[model samples]
Target: AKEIDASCIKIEKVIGVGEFGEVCSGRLKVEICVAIKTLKYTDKQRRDFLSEASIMGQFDHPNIIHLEGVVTKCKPVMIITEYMENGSLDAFLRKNDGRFTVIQLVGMLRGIGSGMKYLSDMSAVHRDLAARNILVNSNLVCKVSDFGMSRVKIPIRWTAPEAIAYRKFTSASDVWSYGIVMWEVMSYGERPYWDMSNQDVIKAIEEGYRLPPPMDCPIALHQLMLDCWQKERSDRPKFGQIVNMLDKLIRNPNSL
Candidate 1:
């Protein structure tokens, strides 16, 4: 991984405290804006943070977040990536609730699907794929991000039942998670399985209950969500198939 000079990064403000340390939106070389992930700072914690950066470095896709470089040669260790003005997709959607048309929403999901397809082809599992983990730009373009958090406890609501059961995570389980992402998107970032406890959600799914379509949600898209949530992970569509389905919907909104 490239080691960026800490002097080259100018942290504008502390965005949030992460598991390692702080996250900030900063400037690279006082020119381009970027997202910076800082670790309080050594070989033990250094190796912990760099492992995520190494996995990030291996990905190359338009719909995937771009890693600028890493800063470990100086005071605060940092992971730098391209700045997304609009920030996380979930908050963006929640802020502009129901503002986007179905076609527009389909476009965003398509980008996410394409990115996941690339990762699956690379045999890399996101392990966690949710709107909150995704970032969107001002132009409404979505990029899959928040990598390597699979080692941490996953959010129960968005996770696949099999993952919760056998602790087995694979592309199929990622597809199951993608269905939850689609539900979040269509619902304008509403909490999945509203007012339901994690155990109840698990029970409901086991009993063949699925999240109902969001208001004004197209049938085709909802059907696709159902396909993703199939109990048998093998029944879920791959990311490539998801992209193609979204493409068909976008090309002909009537199909949705």
Candidate 2:
């Protein structure tokens, strides 16, 4: 990981919080705007935290957040990356309710699928894949972020049935989460199964219940979400397949 001097980072304001620490809007020197994450930890925890930087440093994709560097020598370690102006995907969509075209929404999903495809190809299982974890820039380009460790506390609604029941996460489970994200995008960030308790969601799924399409959601898109929520992991569509499906939909709007 690239090690940056702590003195170089300038925190303009607090943007949000992550599972591990505070996230802020900042800059490198006087001009390079970025997002700075503050993580306080012990020796072993520090090592594990820095490992996330190594993973981010290895990735270079438009649909994946770019890691600028790390500041480990400082009192409070920091991880810096490109600042996403629009913030989290769920919040962004909620603010712009009904403002996006169907094609535009599919375009966002396509970018996410591309990012997931890259991670899956690299043998990485992003146990937390949801609209809240996706970051959007001023240009409305959604990039995947917040790749915290697996087995962490994630929103139960986005989790796959098998992963919830067995705690066994795979690329398939990530796809399952992607389905919940699809509902979020289509519904302009409406909560999944609104007001349903997590236990209710689990029991409903156990009884073979799946999310109904959001108002005006395309039939094809809803079918794709169902495919992602398949009870059998092996039966779920891969990220590559999702990207291809979205590509087709984009190419032919009538397919919806």
Candidate 3:
């Protein structure tokens, strides 16, 4: 990761709370608006916080959050990323619920698919893939974020069955989560299973239950969702395959 001068960063009000600390709006060099992930507080904590920068620094793709740089030499260490104007995808979709066309929603999902494809190709499995971890820009472009950071007892509804059962994290498990993300986008960020208890959701999933399609969700896209939810993790489509499928759908809207 490139080094950023602490003097150049001016922290604004907190925008959101992250794993490390308050994520704040920042001005970089008095010119660029960025998201600054500040260090909260321990050596392991410090290393883990900085580890995010190291992991993120390895990738360069349009659909992945851009790493502006890191503030290491400064008093409070921070990881700076390009500020996404639309913020997290989940909240953005909620605020504009049901306003976007199915095709437009597909466009956003396609960006995510492309990003995941890049990650998969790079052999990096993002254990935390969800709408909440994806950022949307003012242009409605989506970018995968908060990758390479694993926390236990994650939000149950967004997790894959295998992950919930045995802590098995893989790209295939990630595919499962992507299905839920698809559901989230298609339904304008409706909570998965609509407030079902975690245990119930887990039981129902193992009992062969899957989320029904969102109203007016494209037929092909819903099929893709079901495909992603396949019980056998190995049966799920690879991110590359997912990307190709989305491209076809985008190219032929009527096929939906």
Candidate 4:
């Protein structure tokens, strides 16, 4: 990975927070803008911070967040990445609920699927794929991000039944999370499973209760969500398959 000079980056303001520390907006030499992750130094903490950077450094897709470099020679280590103007996909959708056309929503999902397909081809499982983790640019382009939460405990609502039962996280489990993300997009950022307790959610899913279609969500899309939520991980569609399905939907809006 590239080592960035700490002096070059000028912190603008804190935008968000992560497990390690604050996520801030900054500029390189007061010219090129970037997202900077600030983390205090420690052998273990540094390893944890660099882990995500290492993963991101290997990615080079339009729908995947871009990693610029890292600054580890300094006191407060900073991970530099391309700045996403619109922030998280969930927040963006909530800010403009009922404004996006079906085609537009499909377009966003297609980008996410393409990114996941790329990662799957590289033998990388996102483990945590949800609308909140997706970053949106000013152009309405969605990029998959937030790799730090992959191994950490995550919200049970998005996890697959098998994942919750046995803690086995695979690409199929990611498909399950994608299904929840689809619900979020369709509902314009509504929480999954409504106010159901996590325990109740598990019980309901064990009884074959899946989330109903979001208000006005396309029937075809809801069917796709159900396909992802199949109890058997082997039965779920691959990311490539999802990309193709969304591609067809985008190309033929009437099919929706």
Candidate 5:
């Protein structure tokens, strides 16, 4: 692809557009390449776009996309950050299909849980956390990306209760999404919501339903996934506990 320069940075044509912008490939200060996300302005857009930008700017994690800086004077506000040489986690996993082995799954889970812990520590609930939002770097390290749907979790509800219509995302909601992500990773990224509509997905989850882990999914991994998808938010393990459990599994697969 052809490279384009923006504000002293060389921007290359990446393959996709995220929520509000095009994720272009680029290099910063000739040090290393990064992703240049260009955001479009809208008359009805958020007045406090800074809220999202600032929150992301505060994030400091090796497993989460780092918001390098933003240049807002331009028509399409540009945000710079480290690049993912391997592309989206969903696309990566899907490309592997069922070809990945068990060791790979364990490693992937560890990286993902580590990223989740970092975000949770920042008091940020990534409402749309999914494989598609995760970026894999050249070193095969996984980093959580796409903060468009991210929300600050204070004393308010972290996730929407099922009792309400169109529930907003909470930490538990993210965990629910995580379960689906686990299914995707284990299945080597099978397209989720496949063979079903949005309504169907909701109904299935609402009625004590969940995806059975992929046939090749380890029994322990499958059990862990089941626990993560519990409808009762309180029943789910906290991020710390999840990190601990994943660590244990990594140490001894038989124990998992």
Candidate 6:
């Protein structure tokens, strides 16, 4: 689309696929590798696509994925992101089959917390922030990706002051999502529900069912997850607090 030779881009492979798009692994140039997400256009999808791209373009953080640019000449649309060799956290966990040690999980959680803390302080809330959206590179450094369901701060008077579970996404809700992500990392990237159906998982979450234990996870990490998933969003710990807590847990390992 840029008048550059398409064949010269050296597309490696398609690393991720979803209902809406696929991220192709490629080398844009000799030193610039990237993940290019191509979005197929539909009457209903363009609004959301443009919204996500516009928001993503504004974020610049070390722990967050950076949007190099967007290409509109390709019919639907395309977004370029810094390539992550290890791919999404889910893919990495699947490759290992839940074998990562607790320390490694802690490190991943710390990285996520750092990224989310940046968003929270900026009054941004990634409504869908979770393990599947966290990307890890070959060095195992985690970066938060996907801004599709994110929301920015806006005042709402009718919202319940404390937990505020029924209103629009707030900083608190992001923290709740962060907690779920922590659970995912601790479980070696295990999904929220493995064999369970979507309805069942939603029902369980709604009815106060938490992840059952001795899931080969540390007690402190388990408790922290409980704190994060509190239905009342206001009760969730701040990302900064989460970072400190994870660091402490890692340092002591027996702090529980």
How would you encode candidate 4's per-residue C-alpha lDDT over 21-137 as one tens digit per residue? 889998987279999999954687888788888888888999999998899888688899989999999999999999999889989998998888888888787888889999999
The 0-to-1 C-alpha lDDT of every candidate, in the order given, reads 0.89, 0.89, 0.88, 0.89, 0.71, 0.72
Candidate 1, clashing residue pairs? none
Residue pairs clashing, model 3: none
Better of 3 and 6 by lDDT: 3
Residue runs of model 2 more than 4 Å from their true location after superposition:
29-31, 40-48, 150-152
Name the lDDT of candidate 4: 0.89
Clashing pairs in 4: none
Write down the TM-score of every candidate: 0.94, 0.93, 0.94, 0.95, 0.85, 0.82
RMSD of each: 2.0, 2.1, 2.0, 1.8, 4.9, 5.1
For model 1 the local lDDT of residue 44 reads 72
lDDT of 2 by residue, 2-55 (tens): 988888898999987875678899789837899988885567667777777878
Those runs of model 3 whose alpha carbons end farther than 4 Å from true positions after fitting are 148-152
Higher-lDDT candidate among 2 and 3? 2
Candidate 3: Cα lDDT at 223: 90
* TM-score, cand. 3 vs. native: 0.94
- Candidate 4 regions with alpha-carbon error over 4 angstroms: 29-31, 41-44
Error of 4 at 108 (Å): 0.6
Error of 3 at 47 (Å): 1.9
Give lDDT for model 2: 0.89
